[PDB]
Structure formats: structure tokens, C-alpha cells
């Protein structure tokens, strides 16, 4: 609510395409969150017409409710490159749109929980450094002393060591996906809001239509990017998508001239991230019952105790978001053997970060192209 500011770039509303639902589209995308939008953009670049159908408003669910960090820290081999390349593409994004998405290369310091955690993060960095798997330089390393002290300036606790993802990204949920949606519209993606996809029709084993509440659109190619609803949508087509719900709370507070900047993660559940306008995202837990109102207030109190720079900061907004996560915590970016011409791009807790690459992979899978990354760890049939 209060985090969105009407009549500014933080308005948080992009209108759907006007007029009647088109009779045909080369690809129909279900869902106008980041995954549907980014996939649509990728497909239009390949010369295909794209229509997105969205049951509510553009970017109305996970893709405007996120914490806002783009990180590869601790990612397993299955998703490391998805994140590493995702960040690299986010670093190109303001230049690609020519409008500020709020993406910033910010840097992130995470103090380990204990000696065991420090052993584990050191091994993780060492192993990745020995085989990055990309020519994009890796910029994560352990820091101490002056460099650490500068990143944690004004901290009450004498923190001694941290993992520093120097090129961690930041993006703000009041802006990023909305800028991407407007860009998609400018590129010719047509996006119909208040327009739920109900199902499909087929002819001779080929998709013929996406059936919406506003009528049918002719197509033989479908991307399911329905966020938490992807399981439900696929169940109506007799296909099981294993996801389970997860929930996370978020807060936004006003800035301070003495706040340290950056992205910080500390023992005692202290997490904050400076937004592009100098406000700060924070929460009692940012990586998966929701915290109650006393816990949320207490989270701000311990933030302020650790960083007195925030003592006079005002609570701008406080909200919660629903995710849907696969059993192994990795995305589902997959063909569906039951429906040739249909692909799924969903089931991720890191979709903002991953989206530029999962969009490409989704399109590759749809079109039968040599895929950008190994698709096996994202298959629907891995469980
Ligand atoms: C609280 C929270 C914090 C997060 N923090 C981060 C972070 O710091 N960094 C990061 O990278 N990621 C983060 N994530 C994850 C990221 O926000 C999601 O992975 C990503 O937004 C998912 O995008 P999506 O397009 O799949 O889903 P959504 O944005 O939820 O979009 C799916 C859309 O599909 C529509 N839809 C569903 N069914 C239908 C239908 N039948 N017909 C038409 N439309 C339909 C929905 O209305 C919705 O708009 C966070 C998520 C949450 C909830």
C-alpha cells in the first residue's frame, strides 16, 4: 500500500492492453509476473507474436512483493549459473530498456552464523573459484578488517568476518517488474488483465486454443507462468506439478543520512537492503507461519539496536508474499510430455534474479532449440 506512490515512477500499476482479446497469437503466456513478462520479451525478439493473459493486474502477486536481492551466494551447482548469468543480464537491463528498473550492482555482506557456517561458505567459494563455469567474472570473497568495517559502518557489534558478494544486485518491488511490463508492451507483447486462462483445446494432439474467461485465443504454443497457481492450472490438465507453499514477510522503512548502504545479513536475523531511493527493505527472515505483529515490530527494534542510524526511520509499509517451491528448492522450467507445445516456467523462490535466463531457457525448450543451460535439473520429471 504505502510503499507504492501514485504519480511517480513507484506507481506500481501498468494497464493492460485495450480492446478485444486477439483471435490468434504465436505464443500465449499464462501470467503477467516477471517470468511470463520476461519470457514474452524473449519470444518477441525471436520474431513471434505474444499475448499474455493475466487473471488480475500486471505484476500483482510475487513479482511486486519481493525482498529485492539478486544473489548467487550459496547456490548449488543446479542453479549457480542461472543466478550468475541472471545477475549479468540484470546488469544490462537499464541499458536494454533505457528506463531505470531500479537495478543496482550493490554488494552484499553476510556474516556467518558460526565456525561451521564459515567453513561451509569458504568451501563453497573455493569450489566455485576452481571451476566458475562461465567467463563472467566471479566476485564473491571473504572479507575482514577495513573493507568489512566500511560495509558495516555504525554497527553496534564488532563483526569480524563476512562473505562479500561484491556484485550482488538490488531491485525494488515497487518498480522493477512494472518497468519490464511497460517495456514488453512497447515491444508489442499484448497483455490482457482481468482475463484468467481456464484451459486448453487441442486438435490432432496439437494445442489449438487457450480458453479464457473472455473467450478463446488460437495458438499452438503455451507458456505456463502462473506463479503459485501453476500447480492448480496444470492439475486441471491432469499433470502434477510438485510445489508446496511458503510464506515470507517484508517491511520497508525510511532512510537515514548515517545508514551504511548496501545489503547486509547478520546473525540474530538482521537483514536489510538499501533501495534505489534510499529507503530500506528489511524483514525478520528473507530466505525460506508468518511472523506476528509483535515479532515484526521486534525485528525493527533489533535492527535499530544493531544500527542506530535507523532509530528515527519510519515504517513505510509491511506486507507478506506467497511462494510455491519444488521439493529440491530448484525451479521448474520444463517441457510437458502430455502437451507438446506447452512449457512451464515456475516454482522458484528466486524468480526475479533468474528471470532473464529462465526466460531464454523456457523459449529454448518451447522451440526445441539447443538450450542455454542444462535443463535436466529444472525438469518436471526429475522427482
Ligand atoms: C516475499 C517474497 C520475497 C522474495 N524475495 C526475492 C528476492 O529477494 N530475490 C529474488 O530473486 N526473488 C525473490 N522472491 C521470488 C520472486 O519474487 C518470485 O520467484 C517471482 O516473482 C515469481 O514470478 P512469477 O511470474 O512466477 O509469479 P507471479 O509474480 O506471482 O506472477 C504469476 C501471475 O500469474 C497469474 N495467473 C495465475 N494463474 C493464472 C491463470 N490461470 N490465468 C491468468 N493468469 C494467471 C497471477 O495472477 C500472477 O500475476 C521473493 C518472493 C516473495 C513472495
Automatic annotation (TrEMBL):
Specify whether Flavoprotein is a keyword of the entry: yes
Where on this chain does FAD bind? 35, 54-55, 62-63, 67-69, 197, 348, 351, 353
According to the record, the signal peptide region is none
Q: Name one GO cellular component term.
A: cytoplasm
Swiss-Prot/TrEMBL keywords: FAD, Flavoprotein, Nucleotide-binding, Oxidoreductase
Coiled-coil region list: none
Query: What sequence ranges are listed for the domain FAD dependent oxidoreductase?
Result: 26-365
Q: Which domain of life, per UniProt?
A: Bacteria
Instruction: Tell me the InterPro entries matching this sequence.
Output: FAD-dep_OxRdtase, FAD/NAD-bd_sf
Look up keyword Metal-binding and say if it applies. Answer: no
Q: Name one GO molecular function term.
A: oxidoreductase activity
Q: Name one Pfam family in it.
A: DAO
Q: What is this protein called?
A: L-amino acid deaminase
Q: Which organism is it from?
A: Proteus vulgaris
